[PDB]
Write a structure and sequence with these properties.
Layout: H1 5-12, H2 17-27
Family: Belongs to the phosphoglycerate mutase family. BPG-dependent PGAM subfamily.
Subcellular location: Mitochondrion outer membrane; Mitochondrion inner membrane
Protein name: Serine/threonine-protein phosphatase PGAM5, mitochondrial
Length: about 35
């Protein structure tokens, strides 16, 4: 049941949750508490 959970997970990380951090790092250095 965790076989499909691995393929559906990368789907959102292929251009969604990586954007929020992408710009956050492009504007400055991320830190534990602010990012």
């Amino acid at each position: 049941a965790f076989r499909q959970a691995l393929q559906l997970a990368a789907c959102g990380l292929a251009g969604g949750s990586a954007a929020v951090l992408f710009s956050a790092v492009a504007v400055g250095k991320p830190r534990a508490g602010g990012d």
